[PDB]
Assembly symmetry: D2
Homo-oligomer: 237 residues x 4
């Protein structure tokens, strides 16, 4: 039972489980039923960007998704991460396919985290920037169908030799080091994440989406968590 | 007529104009009557730290002030700086003495700004960190009784050779370069500021406070703006 | 008179003054006659990158120039900047043309400078990054024919609306803030600068070149320093 | 067998293995017999600071060690780390004792690493800054006698509750994630490291010294590498 917090980019509306009737981006606290969502004007074949920020002052997690020359989509939710997550965690990217599929490529990824402790008013921090992925990336923990090196890109779900996506796939990419996401004595604590992606699809119904997540350290892909579950949750409850 | 946005660290309660009956920190939009305030347990003779954050997404300006091993004071206010300030501004510190005084020493001052453009999705940034002040700081625009070099600190208001604070003093320090605080075509835009200070006062009634501020490029201390006016506003209206 | 240090991307060989018989990159210490040079494979029509570094430990100024998938040119010169420059400078870019011309487009520019003090061991620093140039770039001091905003790019030399480069042109762009490039009490001083350029010429002999420079605060384009002088030097001695 | 590059801060002169007759700082390349050294005015009881820098242009590894208001010791060596280390490494701190001892307290540690690629021309970075060490630092791998939490410092070697150091102690602290220290496609690669320490001793001859090292991923304290070997080398050959 992993504790999970995520920002999803749902490309397929699973109206059974509370997903609205269109692609959208949402926020997930311990469940695949997003506490808050927002219509996202998904664009197939185009490189997009997702920015996610959070800070220990407003105690608010927000995220923006956009494509060059187009309206951006925003989603925010008030959440006190101190009570939802353990102090040490790991951060990652995650995508899945089901009966429907799409490329779940990641062109770049950046993350910064700062803990400005009470005791000294001296910062603790971590930052990593990936604009190119080496075929043997030793600082990423690839889980599932996640591979690196193809064009300097991170391909989260299985894509064949033809450049075409495979159905029923799941992948996850985690930074090797555990991040100190919060501390009892911190004045301010914050994080900022960004990643550009390319969700291409040869059909008319792409699924299932990508998602930036923060989990307990030893998290692993929940068995059979493909499709609508986006490699994060064991059940749609 | 300057357009001013500031976060004051009001040490003296001027109940004439709206101040609450205790030291407080507050948010000022074009006026000295804080749109929002919060109780601050002002500690005389001790270093404090102040953090001001803001982001184009929640369009919210928060501020946290604190002392090592004590409670922090926080205040936030929802404000679209896009409709209050011009795109090009300058940032600075300001302080004032009136019938009552205090040293308005500034031990360090850091600032970051980023603009994540839409047309390109690439960042534009600025960052400066002063952990020491030379006696001839050429990147600071000193105004009023503001001086540098004394011990490596920035003395906003007049302090004699005796080290004692002087009444009816005003001082401001502005970073030489104009900051591009916002843009119409930007996806995300954020700034963060931090400074440590030392408000000492021989007596029992210190006044009048420090304030980080953003203003129009050619901002100049309003005439006779000492005391309650904290070198930022001409009138108490 | 001005005190100048520069890294030229000399595209036109001026044998009369010392320029070796081919396009090269060099290190100018107070003279257009480079103290050290290196053959450069100037590619007309391609975006290139230049990286300049220097630290107070090695007391060496190096530079690298490269194009995606190609041999990179390197140049280095041991120089003690303490005895060559004043402690406060200004940094900028400079191009020029003479009888022959080329576009001197600047797609991006970034710069970082740090000062780790002796008296305290706490760093002071400045960082600015430009990935887009607004039509009213208020934090750059434009000199000569230099214009911002055309396509988001910086044009150091005159360029027609057609896109054709023009002869006898001189331009510079300095960052607004004076940089504290070195201090006696500094344990370690260092600066890093990067910038991507596009030198497009319609003819066969491009000229005259781009330059990264550190100068005294009030530097300005010398009289008649077009062509082989690259907006930097008054004479050729 | 380990591949190790280090920068010792030899506090005990082991005249039998190549150590000069006095406290020094050295550059070790696959051996405890420093390729290059320089006298160090080791001050017992004061907080020092060490700064290591390297870049793939000069291919020169430099180190500076200083105390507040005291001369700095400098040492540099021309080494092409591409032919000495594997592309993926781990960086960490090490310290040791033997017949004589000292406390090897690290009050802060910082490290930055950049890779400006040739194929792409966009950087890959990693940065971590420790100003405080929690009692369960999950992003550091502790080996031997290294403990976190005591005061907020990292004791590389055994220290009793009294505060007195102990003989024949050994310990390291590596950063959890592997660093991509270099790549064949890299135009520029560089790293900068900084850490402050406090070497206190109750006697007249402290030993054996602290060291910043870069090793292959799976490195571990070699058997018997206490004393003169500083937890890095199996023998003294
Ligand atoms: C036609 O596909 C829809 O109906 C099918 C039969 O009822 C479902 O199996 C299918 O769900 C699966 O695919 C989606 C889209 O890829 C995925 O989100 C879901 O978790 C299942 O794997 C879909 O509803
Ligand atoms: C005891 O001082 C208070 O009462 C005085 C008489 O009513 C006021 O003049 C005085 O105001 C002045 O000092 C304060 C504190 O420094 C300052 O805020 C104000 O602008 C005046 O200079 C204060 O209210
Ligand atoms: C053919 O041009 C060469 O010879 C001419 C006659 O001697 C010179 O005028 C000319 O110099 C000018 O143009 C170059 C090329 O742009 C420039 O580097 C120089 O500063 C003059 O403007 C060149 O030597
Ligand atoms: C007085 O100790 C010196 O002489 C002893 C007898 O010859 C040695 O055992 C001793 O070596 C040990 O201590 C040093 C100092 O801590 C250490 O560097 C060495 O590896 C041994 O542990 C020292 O030479
Ligand atoms: Ca879905
Ligand atoms: Ca007041
Ligand atoms: Ca020339
Ligand atoms: Ca020794
Ligand atoms: Mn959903
Ligand atoms: Mn007030
Ligand atoms: Mn030349
Ligand atoms: Mn030695």
């Amino acid at each position: 039972a992993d504790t999970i917090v995520a920002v999803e980019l749902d490309t397929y509306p699973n109206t059974d489980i509370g997903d609205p009737s269109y692609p959208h981006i949402g926020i997930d606290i311990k469940s695949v039923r997003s506490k808050k969502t927002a219509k996202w004007n998904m664009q197939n074949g185009k490189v997009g960007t997702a920015h996610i920020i959070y800070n220990s002052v407003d105690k608010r997690l927000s995220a923006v998704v956009s494509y060059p020359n187009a309206d951006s989509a925003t989603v925010s939710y008030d959440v006190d991460l101190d009570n939802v997550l353990p102090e040490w965690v790991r951060v990652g990217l995650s995508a899945s396919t089901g009966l429907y599929k799409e490329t779940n490529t990641i062109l770049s990824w950046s993350f910064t985290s700062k803990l400005k402790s009470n005791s000294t008013h001296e910062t603790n921090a971590l930052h990593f920037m990936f604009n190119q992925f080496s075929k043997d990336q030793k600082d990423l923990i690839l889980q599932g169908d996640a591979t690196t090196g193809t064009d300097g890109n991170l391909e989260l779900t299985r894509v064949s030799s033809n450049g075409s996506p495979q159905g029923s796939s799941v992948g996850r990419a985690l930074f090797y080091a555990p991040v100190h996401i919060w501390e009892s004595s911190a004045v301010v604590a914050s994080f900022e994440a960004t990643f550009t992606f390319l969700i291409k699809s040869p059909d008319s119904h792409p699924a299932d989406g990508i998602a930036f997540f923060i989990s307990n350290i030893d998290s692993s892909i929940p068995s059979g968590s493909t499709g609508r579950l986006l490699g994060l949750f064991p059940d749609a409850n």
